[PDB]
Amino acid sequence: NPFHFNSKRFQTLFKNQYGHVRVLQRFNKRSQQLQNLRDYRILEFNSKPNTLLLPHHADADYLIVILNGTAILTLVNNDDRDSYNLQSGDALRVPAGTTYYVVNPDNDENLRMITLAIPVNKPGRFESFFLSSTQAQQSYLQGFSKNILEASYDTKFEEINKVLFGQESVIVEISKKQIRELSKHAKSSSRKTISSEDKPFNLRSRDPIYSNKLGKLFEITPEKNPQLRDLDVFLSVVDMNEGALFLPHFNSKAIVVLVINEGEANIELVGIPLEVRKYRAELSEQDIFVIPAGYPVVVNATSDLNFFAFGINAENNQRNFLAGSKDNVISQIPSQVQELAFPGSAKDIENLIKSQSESYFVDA
Q: What is the largest distance, in Å, between two alpha-carbon atoms of the chain?
A: 89
Q: What is the DSSP string of 99-153?
A: EEEEEE--SS--EEEEEEEEESSBTTB--EEE-S--SS---GGGGS-HHHHHHHH
User: Which of residues 133, 189, 227, 286 is near its own copies by CB under 8 A?
Assistant: 133
In the complex, minimum distance from the CB of residue 64 to its own copies, in angstroms, rounded to a whole number: 17
Phi/psi zone of residue 263: left (φ > 0), alpha (ψ -120 to 50 degrees), beta? Answer: left
26 within 8 A of 12, measured Cβ to Cβ? no
Residue 154 binds to its own copies (criterion: CB under 8 A): yes
Residues 303-332 that bind its own copies (CB under 8 A): 313, 316-324, 327-330, 332
- Measure the CA–CA gap between 348 and 251, rounded to whole angstroms: 27
Q: Which stretch binds its own copies (CB under 8 A): 106-114, 198-206, 232-240, 346-354?
A: 346-354
Q: In whole angstroms, what is the distance from residue 129 CA to residue 59 CA? A: 8
The verdict on 11 binding its own copies (CB under 8 A) reads no
Q: Is 341 in the site for its own copies (CB under 8 A)?
A: yes
**Residues listed for the chain:** 364
3 state SS of 312: strand
- Looking at residues 42 to 71 of the shown chain, list those that interact with its own copies (rule: CB under 8 A): 52, 54-55, 57-59, 61
Q: Which pairing describes strands 244-251 and 297-301: parallel, antiparallel, or unpaired?
A: antiparallel
Does residue 222 touch its own copies according to CB under 8 A?
A: no
Residues with their C more than 2.5 Å from the N of the next written residue in the chain, i.e. before a break, are 166, 272
As a whole number of angstroms, the distance between CA 299 and CA 288 comes to 13
For residue 281, the partner it binds in Mg ion, its own copies, none, with Cβ less than 5 to 8 A by kind, is none
Binding segment for Mg ion among 50-58, 120-128, 241-249, 305-313 (CB under 5 A)? 50-58
143 touches its own copies by CB under 8 A: yes
Applying CB under 8 A, among 7, 142, 190, 303 the residue interacting with its own copies is: 142
Backbone angles phi, psi at 195, to 5 degrees: -115, 30
Q: At closest approach, how far in Å is the CB of 357 from Mg ion?
A: 38
The residue among 107 and 357 lying less far from its own copies, judged by its C-beta, is: 357
Judged by CB under 8 A, the stretch of 15-23, 63-71, 203-211, 294-302 that binds its own copies is 294-302
264 binds its own copies (CB under 8 A): no
Contact assessment for residue 64 and residue 115, using Cβ atoms and an 8 Å cutoff:
yes
Q: Is the distance from CB of 260 to CB of 228 less than 8 angstroms?
A: no
Residue type, 358: E
For residues 229 and 311, give the distance between their C-alpha atoms in angstroms, rounded to a whole number. Answer: 12
Q: Which of residues 80-109 bind its own copies (CB under 8 A)?
A: 80-81, 95-99, 101
Candidate residues 85, 292, 310, 361; the one interacting with its own copies per rule CB under 8 A: 292
In this chain, which stretch among 46-54, 83-91, 239-247, 324-332 interacts with Mg ion, using CB under 5 A? 46-54
Closest approach, Cβ 175 to Mg ion, in A, equals 6
Q: How far is the C-alpha of 64 from the C-alpha of 113, rounded, in Å?
A: 7
Residue with smaller CB distance to its own copies, 115 or 261:
115
Task: Give, as one character, the DSSP assignment of residue 187.
Answer: B
> In this chain, which of 65, 73, 113, 255 binds its own copies, going by CB under 8 A?
255
Which 163-192 residues touch its own copies, going by CB under 8 A?
163-167, 172, 174, 178, 181-182
Please tell me whether residue 29 binds its own copies under the rule CB under 8 A: no
Asked if 30 touches its own copies (CB under 8 A), the answer is: no
- Kindly determine how many residues on this chain lie close enough to bind its own copies according to the rule CB under 8 A: 127
> What is the binding site for Mg ion (CB under 5 A)?
50
